[PDB]
């Protein structure tokens, strides 16, 4: 992982994820939506295993984007949890949870769940 | 489980769940919403382990309600997955997924996730 994780990743819809994996387990970078505009950019922060197992196990990781920047506030945050799998066609496989700020009466509709695959290509 | 599962159960919001657990693993019954009207009643069907382990493990179970009856169609279905824990204050602990029928463009907002506890009291 590490230098294999660093770089640009794309999901099946066209979103772009740019990350630097640091030497002691930090992930920092930006998430850019479809349309690809100069801000549908949002800051991301996360963590990964920097000493992963040596058999063929993937590298466990996760990160958060809060959907506020200088142009937009969508009053929500998404966490992605998954693993990096290296080699010839490297990918990152994730499940995600998206939570919106709600009143306590509407709290039953606060969290959506789905899944995403990122490739280098 | 079985005769311990049969009967009336209540969650923290006041919804009422009525189930018969059958001899070979079937669950059949009705779910009634808050307000408690003569139809906010919906049919449920599910399955449970009828030969559970004999140490203190819970009984694994799940069920589905599609939200259509004679008065209302909400074009959605919920599955509850959990376990029954018996004894002095018996409860059923669940996580649930609620999916709405969407177009493929809106398919990112189809499934909500939450959790529920049912007691006899």
């Amino acid at each position: 992982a590490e230098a294999g994780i660093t770089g640009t990743w794309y999901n099946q819809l066209g979103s772009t994820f740019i990350v630097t994996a640091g030497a002691d387990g930090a992930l920092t970078g930006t998430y850019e939506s479809a349309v690809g505009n100069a801000e549908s950019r949002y800051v991301l922060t996360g963590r990964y295993d920097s000493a992963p197992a040596t058999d063929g196990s993937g590298t466990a990781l996760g990160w958060t984007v809060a959907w506020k920047n200088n142009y937009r506030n969508a009053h929500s945050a998404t966490t992605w949890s998954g693993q990096y799998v290296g080699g010839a066609e490297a990918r990152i496989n994730t499940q995600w949870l998206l939570t919106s700020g709600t009143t306590e009466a509407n709290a039953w509709k606060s969290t959506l769940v789905g899944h995403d695959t990122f490739t280098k290509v | 489980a079985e005769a311990g599962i049969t009967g009336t159960w209540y969650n923290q919001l006041g919804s009422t769940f009525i189930v018969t657990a059958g001899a070979d693993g079937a669950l059949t019954g009705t779910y009634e919403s808050a307000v408690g009207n003569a139809e906010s009643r919906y049919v449920l069907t599910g399955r449970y382990d009828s030969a559970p382990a004999t140490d203190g493990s819970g009984t694994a179970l799940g069920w589905t309600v599609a939200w259509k009856n004679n008065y209302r169609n909400a074009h959605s279905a919920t599955t509850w997955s959990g376990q029954y824990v018996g004894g002095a204050e018996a409860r059923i602990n669940t996580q649930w997924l609620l999916t709405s029928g969407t177009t493929e463009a809106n398919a990112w907002k189809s499934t909500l996730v939450g959790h529920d506890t049912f007691t006899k009291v």
């Binding site: 998430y31 939506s33 984007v65 969508a74 | 907002k109």
Partner: peptide
């Protein structure tokens, strides 16, 4: 449609 999507 949410910024994660559009």
């Amino acid at each position: 449609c949410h910024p994660q999507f559009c």
